[PDB]
Amino acid sequence: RFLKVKNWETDVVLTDTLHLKSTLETGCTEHICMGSIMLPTKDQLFPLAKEFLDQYYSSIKRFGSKAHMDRLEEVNKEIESTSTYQLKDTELIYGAKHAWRNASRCVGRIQWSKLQVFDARDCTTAHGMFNYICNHVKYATNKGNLRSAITIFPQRTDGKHDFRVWNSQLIRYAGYKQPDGSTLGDPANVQFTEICIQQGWKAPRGRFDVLPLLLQANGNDPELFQIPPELVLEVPIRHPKFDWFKDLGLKWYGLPAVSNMLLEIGGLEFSACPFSGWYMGTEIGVRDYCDNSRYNILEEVAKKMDLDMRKTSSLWKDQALVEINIAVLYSFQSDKVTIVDHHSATESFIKHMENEYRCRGGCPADWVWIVPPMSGSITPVFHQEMLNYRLTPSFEYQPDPWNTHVW
Amino acid sequence: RFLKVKNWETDVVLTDTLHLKSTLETGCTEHICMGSIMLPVRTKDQLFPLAKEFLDQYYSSIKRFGSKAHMDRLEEVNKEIESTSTYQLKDTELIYGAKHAWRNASRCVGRIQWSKLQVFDARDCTTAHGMFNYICNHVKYATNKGNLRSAITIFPQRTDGKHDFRVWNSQLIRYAGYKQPDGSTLGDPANVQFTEICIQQGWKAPRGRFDVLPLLLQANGNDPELFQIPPELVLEVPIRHPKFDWFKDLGLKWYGLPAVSNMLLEIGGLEFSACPFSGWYMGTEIGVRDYCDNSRYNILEEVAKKMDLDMRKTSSLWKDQALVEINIAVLYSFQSDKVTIVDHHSATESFIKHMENEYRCRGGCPADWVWIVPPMSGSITPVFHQEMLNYRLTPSFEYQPDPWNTHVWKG
Numbered sequence: 028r029f030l031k032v033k034n035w036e037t038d039v040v041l042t043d044t045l046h047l048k049s050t051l052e053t054g055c056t057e058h059i060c061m062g063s064i065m066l067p068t069k070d071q072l073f074p075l076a077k078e079f080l081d082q083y084y085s086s087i088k089r090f091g092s093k094a095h096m097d098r099l100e101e102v103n104k105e106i107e108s109t110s111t112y113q114l115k116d117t118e119l120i121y122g123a124k125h126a127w128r129n130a131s132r133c134v135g136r137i138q139w140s141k142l143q144v145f146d147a148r149d150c151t152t153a154h155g156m157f158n159y160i161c162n163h164v165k166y167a168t169n170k171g172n173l174r175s176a177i178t179i180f181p182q183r184t185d186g187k188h189d190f191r192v193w194n195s196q197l198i199r200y201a202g203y204k205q206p207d208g209s210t211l212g213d214p215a216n217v218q219f220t221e222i223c224i225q226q227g228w229k230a231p232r233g234r235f236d237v238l239p240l241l242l243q244a245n246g247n248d249p250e251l252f253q254i255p256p257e258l259v260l261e262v263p264i265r266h267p268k269f270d271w272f273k274d275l276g277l278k279w280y281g282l283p284a285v286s287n288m289l290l291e292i293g294g295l296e297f298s299a300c301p302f303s304g305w306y307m308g309t310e311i312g313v314r315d316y317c318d319n320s321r322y323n324i325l326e327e328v329a330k331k332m333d334l335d336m337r338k339t340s341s342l343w344k345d346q347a348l349v350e351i352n353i354a355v356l357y358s359f360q361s362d363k364v365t366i367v368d369h370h371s372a373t374e375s376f377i378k379h380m381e382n383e384y385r386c387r388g389g390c391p392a393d394w395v396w397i398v399p400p401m402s403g404s405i406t407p408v409f410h411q412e413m414l415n416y417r418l419t420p421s422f423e424y425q426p427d428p429w430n431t432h433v434w
Numbered sequence: 435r436f437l438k439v440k441n442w443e444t445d446v447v448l449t450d451t452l453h454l455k456s457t458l459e460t461g462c463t464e465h466i467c468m469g470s471i472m473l474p475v476r477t478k479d480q481l482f483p484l485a486k487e488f489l490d491q492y493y494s495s496i497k498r499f500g501s502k503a504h505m506d507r508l509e510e511v512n513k514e515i516e517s518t519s520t521y522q523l524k525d526t527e528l529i530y531g532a533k534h535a536w537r538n539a540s541r542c543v544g545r546i547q548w549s550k551l552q553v554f555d556a557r558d559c560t561t562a563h564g565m566f567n568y569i570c571n572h573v574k575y576a577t578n579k580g581n582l583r584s585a586i587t588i589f590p591q592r593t594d595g596k597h598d599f600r601v602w603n604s605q606l607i608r609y610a611g612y613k614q615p616d617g618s619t620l621g622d623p624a625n626v627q628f629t630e631i632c633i634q635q636g637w638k639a640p641r642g643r644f645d646v647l648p649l650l651l652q653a654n655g656n657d658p659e660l661f662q663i664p665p666e667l668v669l670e671v672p673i674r675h676p677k678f679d680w681f682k683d684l685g686l687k688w689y690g691l692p693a694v695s696n697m698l699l700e701i702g703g704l705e706f707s708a709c710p711f712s713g714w715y716m717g718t719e720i721g722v723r724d725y726c727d728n729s730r731y732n733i734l735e736e737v738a739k740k741m742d743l744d745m746r747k748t749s750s751l752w753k754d755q756a757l758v759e760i761n762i763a764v765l766y767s768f769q770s771d772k773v774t775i776v777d778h779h780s781a782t783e784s785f786i787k788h789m790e791n792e793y794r795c796r797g798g799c800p801a802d803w804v805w806i807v808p809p810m811s812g813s814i815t816p817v818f819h820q821e822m823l824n825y826r827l828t829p830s831f832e833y834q835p836d837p838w839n840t841h842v843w844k845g
């Protein structure tokens with residue numbers, strides 16, 4: 028019940044004691060591993076609050092203090108009376124940083140303690156939400172010197188007054204279905220893009236149109252807003268060798284900002300909690316650009332390189348894949364926008380893992396997600412055994428709002 | 435209970451019922467996933483149900499379930515167990531068993547070929563010399579002058595655990611590794627420990643970068659003995675690159691026949707501790723792992739220099755760039771010499787089809803994503819996008835500890 032993890036490249040062995048604090052379930056059993064599956068009350072509430080306050084008060088070296096006991100007491104009385112409770116600013120911030128710290132699929136967690144937390148719990152309207160989000164975007168972007176941030180909207184009450192950001196990311200490109208039968212723009216956002224139009228957006232039907240925000244406040248119907256274009260930092264994609272690369276017409280945005288997840292702290296649920304950091308190059312160049320059900324540009328790039336696309340064994344796809352990822356990195360660096368390559372990032376994560384094992388007794392990690400989608404085994408994380416388990420506070424997936432929303 | 439897997443590229447959803455027949459444990463719990471962990475004397479008591487399950491499967495496959503032939507076989511095995519404490523498999527059961535272990539191997543991307551396996555019954559073997567002869571024949575047969583054929587050779591099953599047949603090599607053909615006094619390694623760093631044993635056992639090492647290791651063979655629980663595979667039986671491929679003429683000058687070659695020889699084959703509760711098996715390589719095994727792992731030949735740097743890449747910042751992706759050209763070279767060299775090999779695109783695409791077919795005809799296909807996804811270019815292969823379910827079925831191939839750690843030396 029004390030578990031070891033081995034790195035098969037360095038022979039370093041770490042002992043995991045942290046998993047014994049695990050609460051939630053994995054989806055795996057003694058008889059079946061689901062490691063590759065993408066998505067596997069006042070009475071309920073109090074022990075959750077308690078579990079959280081215990082780790083909060085432990086973290087500040089005041090476990091079993093009067094102040095600790097006083098807070099447990101106060102929170103308990105508030106639950107019994109109000110059916111919920113409110114987090115102190117200090118607890119809110121601790122919770123957000125620790126939700127990030129606990130995200131087993133995140134390779135960038137060495138940065139976890141340096142998260143700018145924006146308390147947006149006083150927000151009451153979609154306009155308010157828009158304002159808070161423009162401020163987030165501007166702060167995180169910081170003229171290209173990106174800073175990690177989260178903005179936290181009011182917590183769920185009865186599930187009928189939910190705050191939700193309908194976009195999956197604050198900043199994404201639209202996708203439309205052409206009469207051609209093909210797809211224009213980002214195919215992953217076809218359904219969302221339609222909903223924008225079904226709600227009144229006038230799409231300029233381009234290939235790289237920054238989607239508008241669809242914001243839902245206090246359970247009400249969601250509203251449309253356009254992010255000030257001057258706040259959306261974008262990078263034209265060129266190659267340091269291939270002069271022709273720029274004619275491909277590619278560009279991407281600098282700010283990865285996940286906005287559809289659910290933040291859980293002390294049993295309290297934050298359904299609207301957009302957060303952002305900075306890209307690892309492969310996210311854009313391997314997944315966004317080369318995935319078959321995304322921008323899927325491998326073939327066109329291959330042709331421009333005049334590769335032998337006759338047989339798979341010429342590895343023409345692999346060759347182009349590398350150059351495309353060279354270009355992304357080169358373009359962001361040239362425009363001074365923060366980005367990290369997959370080698371630096373995974374090397375960072377190995378140190379973080381080391382630090383966590385040493386200072387916390389473990390680091391929950393999902394190998395399937397941590398190993399980059401290119402060049403896997405030449406990155407050190409590939410040779411690193413990882414233990415995956417669920418800790419709270421946490422970021423959780425939640426259903427898309429349209430399949431839920433009672434208009 | 436039914437289970438759903440989704441391919442996130444095609445939205446093809448499949449339904450697993452086969453996991454219901456799963457016996458062994460995974461290492462995972464409701465509270466922990468051990469999916470990325472590499473590695474997470476039987477009595478009559480446990481033996482007959484295992485025998486019975488196997489014979490029930492076999493007779494179902496041949497459409498003779500509940501036949502007099504089926505029932506008589508069960509009773510025969512029952513008697514043989516309770517009288518002799520074990521039992522012998524018919525030739526037909528051994529063949530079926532071996533094919534199904536391969537079929538059940540959740541880490542093997544090459545399973546589309548599982549029904550075409552040449553099974554060599556070496557259960558009449560008694561000595562290490564006999565083992566060598568069988569293994570020579572396996573190599574000659576499987577190699578087939580470059581037109582590779584899958585094969586497995588099966589030596590006598592375990593009895594009391596004190597008379598085990600074992601092949602001490604991890605693979606039948608592998609290069610020596612020698613640790614030097616300065617700390618550097620000559621040849622394959624993965625094989626240093628085994629090379630040392632061989633040398634200690636009396637092997638005269640040539641001490642080059644690509645020395646084929648001798649076989650170290652243990653029969654009937656006796657001390658192991660050394661044998662040199664006839665070099666004419668060892669097919670090798672000099673590695674060159676289709677565009678880079680300096681590549682040949684790196685001095686690289688590799689052997690054509692991948693033959694795992696340290697695993698344990700379990701069939702109907704019987705344990706076959708010596709069961710070398712062989713197929714043909716997927717290109718990345720050599721070009722990505724064998725050549726480019728930091729803990730193996732580790733040639734990325736030398737290749738990158740000769741290519742004149744910007745090696746100062748990793749963000750030049752010089753490592754990535756060199757890796758591709760190396761893997762291009764391996765594929766080119768093998769094809770040019772007409773030695774069977776498959777690229778990772780071709781292999782993973784075939785596996786997806788195999789998998790889908792397995793869900794339809796069998797109710798599932800246990801698969802270890804972590805191992806199935808190739809070590810370069812992950813998401814441009816279709817397996818990356820495929821949800822998989824991992825579970826353990828018998829017959830199976832199992833890990834066993836290295837013999838030198840358990841062997842009782844006779845002297």
Ligand code: HEM
Pocket residue numbers: 127130132133134135136138142175176177288302303304305306307310367372396422
């Ligand atoms: C600052 C630099 C950061 C880097 C380099 C980074 C990198 C990554 C990458 C590559 C993934 C895999 C996601 C995918 O492939 O779609 C991921 C997942 C994730 N990250 Fe991070 N991230 C960063 C910041 C953050 C921050 C600031 C938070 C929260 C405050 C966060 C929380 C998460 C969560 C919850 C996931 C899982 C998302 C999912 O399951 O879809 N990350 N990260």
Ligand code: HEM
Pocket residue numbers: 532536539541542543544545547551584585586697711712713714715716719776781805831
């Ligand atoms: C015919 C072409 C074949 C191909 C292309 C192939 C491919 C592979 C690859 C790439 C691996 C991962 C190896 C590694 O990364 O260390 C693997 C694993 C495995 N294969 Fe196959 N294989 C083939 C044939 C076979 C045969 C004939 C058998 C048995 C009869 C077999 C049984 C297994 C087993 C048990 C593993 C797991 C090994 C381990 O866990 O270390 N394969 N296969």
Ligand SMILES: CNCCN(C)c1cc(CCc2cc(C)cc(N)n2)cc(C(F)(F)F)c1
Pocket residue numbers: 195196283284285287288302303304305306307310311314315
């Ligand atoms: C269910 N929400 C997650 C799914 N989404 C919308 C998502 C999200 C990302 C970004 C993940 C991420 C998040 C952050 C904060 C930083 C960073 N570098 N990367 C990339 C991508 C992808 F794969 F690049 F397309 C998709």
Ligand SMILES: CNCCN(C)c1cc(CCc2cc(C)cc(N)n2)cc(C(F)(F)F)c1
Pocket residue numbers: 544604605692693694695696697711712713714715716719723724
């Ligand atoms: C502990 N079990 C054996 C581990 N060994 C010695 C082994 C073996 C292989 C060969 C795997 C394989 C086996 C077969 C039958 C076909 C094929 N294409 N590849 C590759 C590799 C590796 F890792 F790719 F180099 C290692």
Ligand SMILES: C[C@H](O)[C@H](O)[C@H]1CNc2nc(N)[nH]c(=O)c2N1
Pocket residue numbers: 063064065395396397442818819820821822
């Ligand atoms: C089916 C499989 O789980 C799916 O393709 C996963 C694999 N690993 C991943 N890893 C990351 N970082 N991001 C992803 O979207 C995925 N997708």
Ligand SMILES: C[C@H](O)[C@H](O)[C@H]1CNc2nc(N)[nH]c(=O)c2N1
Pocket residue numbers: 035409410411412413469470471472804805806
């Ligand atoms: C720790 C991790 O499980 C280990 O590096 C695994 C990853 N996946 C693999 N996949 C294959 N095919 N072969 C391997 O040796 C490994 N090694």
Ligand SMILES: [Zn+2]
Pocket residue numbers: 055056059060061062462466467468469
């Ligand atoms: Zn698992």
